[PDB]
A paper describes a structure:
A subfamily of autotransporters, including AIDA-I (adhesin involved in diffuse adherence) from diffusely adhering E. coli (DAEC) 2787 and TibA from enterotoxigenic E. coli (ETEC) H10407, are glycosylated in their passenger domains, which functions in bacterial autoaggregation and adhesion to host cells. TibC catalyzes TibA/AIDA-I heptosylation and confers AIDA-I-mediated bacterial adhesion to host cells. Here we determine the crystal structures of TibC heptosyltransferase, both alone and in complex with ADP-D-glycero-β-D-manno-heptose (ADP-D,D-heptose). All the 12 TibC protomers adopt an identical structure containing an N-terminal β-barrel domain, a core catalytic domain, a β-hairpin thumb, and an iron-finger motif which are arranged into a palm-like shape.
A number of point mutations designed to reduce the surface entropy were screened and a TibC variant with three mutated epitopes (E83A/E84A, K400A/K401A, and Q215A/E216A) produced the highest quality crystal. This mutant exhibited identical biochemical and biological functions to wild-type TibC. Strikingly, one asymmetric unit in the solved structure contains 12 TibC molecules, which are assembled into a large ring structure. The overall shape of the dodecamer ring resembles a circular garland with an external diameter of 145 Å and a height of 72 Å. The inner surface of the stem is decorated with uniformly distributed 12 ferric ions, forming a characteristic iron belt along the ring. Six symmetric TibC protomers project upwards from the central plate while the other six project downwards, generating a gear-like shape at both sides. Two adjacent TibC protomers projecting oppositely contact each other in a back-to-back manner around a dyad axis; six back-to-back dimers are further linked together in a hand-in-hand fashion around a sixfold axis to form the garland-like ring. The β-hairpin thumb mediates the hand-in-hand contact between adjacent dimers. Within the module, a ferric ion is tetrahedrally coordinated by four conserved cysteine residues (Cys-339, 342, 358, and 370 in TibC), analogous to the zinc-finger motif. Thus, the iron finger is required for maintaining structural integrity of the TibC dodecamer.
Author numbering:
A (entry chain I), C (entry chain K): 10 to 398
B (entry chain G): 11 to 399
The structure:
């Protein structure tokens, strides 16, 4: 996933400059004074004297950089080029991060291209490509190992950067929301939007039904209330809905802590292509889930989404009137800039790990609370149209 | 200031309330009290009190359920659940600045439409004159002359510092100072402009732009030496007349004073806000700071160029013309590890009394602002007023 | 700044002596006894036995020195030379200091020449040369880098010496006044006088007008009263005067502290030749300024000068009945021998930096105070003239 070993642009004096991984310039032997500017503000971002080697901007997100190379003590610069992306090869590289990450990030990539009118290629796992590519003919999708461009003018690496990093992102993603961070990185309208999907599939299950997602990547994201899911599933049926579980896994966990597809839900679990999930989701009356990926997919299918989460604040994901949250105990571990997410600890709870208050984030969210929300949504579905937002 | 005695009204002598945030007062002799959240059915607080006031630690909106038990009895004496329909409710704002109130107010209207209550709001006369005509369903008064006298519930909308989570559900710095009001009242947290009287006819014939350069602390000022002057000169070169509409022409502390910029026309002074609304309405656009006039300008439906470095772009209302620089210190105001000082006009927690003081806004050059002005100007001439907003 | 590397006058046995940088004698290879005397008092200033190398007076200001060199055992001296400046090449070197410095010092250089009847060359920036040279045909003007007399008999470097230095100046300039110090250095009548200017230019602006200078070299010299300038400018107009600001810069400052041409003053700013400023000043009814340079120029064009200053005492600059000063708080940072001016700190206030009281020097000088003195000046002008003394 590395940038070219040598910058892709030819400077007048055997000098190569690049905007892959930020503004780069490789100097041949000589005497130089190099300047990086922000073209929009005219500010001098960085400035130094060197003989040969590398000069790279500390900022890696989108900046309209302007590179200037001077012979020490000269009046005009030998090289003076400003980033201009129109009709030029650009690479946006996503990591093979979770599903929710990409569905959140991706629209911002399309915005970047409409704005700059560049030749854009994006890199991600094949399964997302199969899901999205047809709806974005403007953009070329590839895999990290076989990108078509080979030599690009500019590259941007959209992802999450922890520990408050402000070199790869303009603002800490925790301040703006993990998905909106993509917009800031790329310098586009940061307002959230759903991906475009193939919503042409015809209805298969005739009766009214609801989809649910109970599994996630860490325990904190689970709804850790003892009887929550069982109370919800029972209630959904008492309203006349069939209930299907569409989690990738039927059992998931670590050590002795294991989570299983709830008794009473239908087994639509399994790892299959996302398009099949889209097709099933499309005709669901609504969806109940966690802040992991499937909720973003449900969102993009244009159906109501009941989102249950205590470890993140309501503004941490896309807006839904059906968001569930409880503010009486610990909440928002995830958005707190004084704490640090541990990728390796599935049982991560910064403030209460190994105490009887562990995962209070979600234990305070009762089935009654979730059913209350479901009742309002149900009334709105009967009494008002589906169209009623 | 809640009533000295709860305004209910419970069948036995003791009176219960929701004015501070609930409240029960019990005559001498033992009882056991239970506070619940009707939505989740969780027991929030539980105790035995022989005498005195028992009140919830949470003061923001919750569907409280008060239960009073005789010791060791199985059934409760009192079991009242908050129901606001057709009842006197008081929303008390502080006499804070303009921007605060304009930002918060729409949430109070939402609270009313949701609960169908009899709502009275308390605020400075100044704002009442501006808003009252457009919110006929709500009663407006001043803090010293409230008409309700006896209210069923009271809610105190404001900013609470130091990470307080008793008067607000979530630290306002995590959600935005204005959106906090929606969380306190428990309604749709999405920002909206207030409704104004936009009937006034055009007075100044030629195209013009309004600007606001003053603010409440030095950090909210545009501390770039030549910023304003470069902008004002540029505006004129595009054919715009420029008017300054700040309440004061000179404002500051100690030796630090800010003045209406040379070259701007003098429309300053403490006028009724409606006159500012009338002038603003026909301005091609507005340039200001995260202070109050920007919120007024917003609500008059004209494009707003908003310059701010101490505040992240997300925090105020959205505008595609937000100016922000991410290369140095930024966001003093949103940072939960720091603390705003009301008494220090020269507040800069990270760089006070150093070379970098107010870097927040010194990095924002006139060129940067003129770049944004140029795009907005282009969009106004190319497209219409429709197509921008 | 540099004196010849070898003294310009030849003594008998290969000794070179001169007075360029104090009294100097370069001795080659012998056992010598050297005495420096003050011919006026006959005092032996310095006395020593030296084998080879340099012997210079510690005193560098004007002294009628008498150099005597002895063989170690000798009854009488082989060098008996005593300073005599008649018809001899003398160099007076000014630093490239501010305008007020030079205009204050210069008259004393002319006095030194009238007194001693020598051939005098002066070194200073070109812009001052253009202003003065025509009125001082007796004196030869040059710039520091291109001096015409490469072998001078005596040299004197007029300037400010800090830290109570008494080797380059007879007495601390803070005790006698920065401008008068020049006369002490040169040993002439120390009484202040204005420079001779070309006052022949004809009137251009017909109506009555006042010139003002609001900018300066450090913040302490600004009139840091919040509403001062604005109140003065408004008042001048109500008296029928047009007001022009003639500062070199329209904006000046450092960090976040910036000063701008006051709203309401006509813009006559910019880096123009001083002769254009003299021509404009000449016909002004009067001038209002700070202890910086333009006030000295105003003075010399023979118009009444209102001088506002708190960081220096009234006697610190030239006499004017229109000097404005406030004695109730901190004043006179500048004249205080126990403090030290900081050339590198634009926000220097030794007593009160970084406190509420910073620049109390001039916050105590209100617009009312200045308008009071303007009123008196105005009455005297309408009634008596011009001639006003
Ligand atoms: Fe937690
Ligand atoms: Fe700051
Ligand atoms: Fe002082």
């Amino acid at each position: 996933i590395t940038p070219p070993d040598t910058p892709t642009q030819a400077g007048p004096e055997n000098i190569f400059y690049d905007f892959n991984d930020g503004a780069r310039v490789l100097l041949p032997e000589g005497k130089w004074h190099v300047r990086l500017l922000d073209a929009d503000s005219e500010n001098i971002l960085f400035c130094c004297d060197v003989d040969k080697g590398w000069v790279t901007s500390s900022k890696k997100y989108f900046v309209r950089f302007r590179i200037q190379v001077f012979r020490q003590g000269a009046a005009t610069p030998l090289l003076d080029e400003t980033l201009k992306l129109k009709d030029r090869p650009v690479l946006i590289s996503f990591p093979t991060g979770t599903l929710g990450d990409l569905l959140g990030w991706f629209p911002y990539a399309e915005r970047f291209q409409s704005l700059h009118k560049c030749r854009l290629e994006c890199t991600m796992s094949q399964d997302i490509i199969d899901l999205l590519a047809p709806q974005y003919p403007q953009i070329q999708f590839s895999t990290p190992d076989k990108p078509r461009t080979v030599a690009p003018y500019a590259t941007y690496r959209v992802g999450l950067y922890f520990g408050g990093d402000t070199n790869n992102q303009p603002v800490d993603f925790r301040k703006v929301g993990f998905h909106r961070s993509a917009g800031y990185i790329l310098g586009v309208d940061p307002r959230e939007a759903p991906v475009r999907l193939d919503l042409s599939a015809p209805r298969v299950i005739a009766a009214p039904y609801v989809c649910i997602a109970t599994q996630s990547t860490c325990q904190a994201k689970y709804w850790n209330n003892g009887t929550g899911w069982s109370e919800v599933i029972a209630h959904l049926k008492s309203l006349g809905y069939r209930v299907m579980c569409i989690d990738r896994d039927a059992h998931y966990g670590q050590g002795f802590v294991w989570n299983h597809i709830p008794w009473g839900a239908e087994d639509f679990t399994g790892k299959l292509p996302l398009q099949e999930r889209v097709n099933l989701l499309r005709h669901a009356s609504f969806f109940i889930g966690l802040p992991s990926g499937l909720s973003w997919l449900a969102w993009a299918t244009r159906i109501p989404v009941v989102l249950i989460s205590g470890f993140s604040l309501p503004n941490s994901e896309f807006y839904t009137p059906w968001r569930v949250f409880n503010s009486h105990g610990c909440y928002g571990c995830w958005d707190d800039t004084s704490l640090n997410f541990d990728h390796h600890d599935f049982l991560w709870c910064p403030r209460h790990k190994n105490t009887d208050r562990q995962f209070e984030c979600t234990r305070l969210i009762t089935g009654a609370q979730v059913n209350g929300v479901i009742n309002k949504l149900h009334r709105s579905l009967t009494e008002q149209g589906v169209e009623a937002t």
